[PDB]
Amino acid sequence: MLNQELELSLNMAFARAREHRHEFMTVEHLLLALLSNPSAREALEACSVDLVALRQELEAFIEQTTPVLPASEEERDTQPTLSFQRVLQRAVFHVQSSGRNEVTGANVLVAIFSEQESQAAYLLRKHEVSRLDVVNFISHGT
């Protein structure tokens, strides 16, 4: 089960994207929303990430590369990208494969690293965070 805070993060990301009329809710919208999801935020602070710079790089990339639906088009609305779907599915899988059920924003952060052609994974590595960095933090704290 996606925990409550993760679910709050996802629904607001989606609402923000719909309000901006974006054709897609991307893995970048997802990472941007995790910046303020306690669980994922804590992991990132533990990796000494400049959350202000990352927020900015995410917002710029999002508005510059996400197609906007025509004021006309009201028959189709904001859809998640395939990459976004895979990340959620991967986060559930990683948690279940360890015998647990609660999915947190930090597990979703771990799953983002597997979308190798995503700007989100790129940016995370650019800020020197590895998948294992996040897993160690989840397993062993700071």
> Integer distance in angstroms from the first to the last C-alpha of the chain?
25
Region of 48-56, 75-83, 103-111, 134-142 interacting with another protein (CB under 8 A): 75-83
Q: How far is the CB of 22 from Zn ion (least distance, A)?
A: 5
Q: Cα angle at 94 between 105 and 24, to 5 degrees?
A: 55
- Residue 19 as a binder of another protein (CB under 8 A): the answer is no
Residue 20 touches which of Zn ion, another protein, none (Cβ within 5-8 Å per kind): Zn ion
Site residues (vs Zn ion, CB under 5 A): 20
Chain breaks in the chain (C to N over 2.5 A) after: none
Closest CA to 29 of 77, 74, 61: 61
Among 13, 17, 24, 54, binds another protein (CB under 8 A): 24
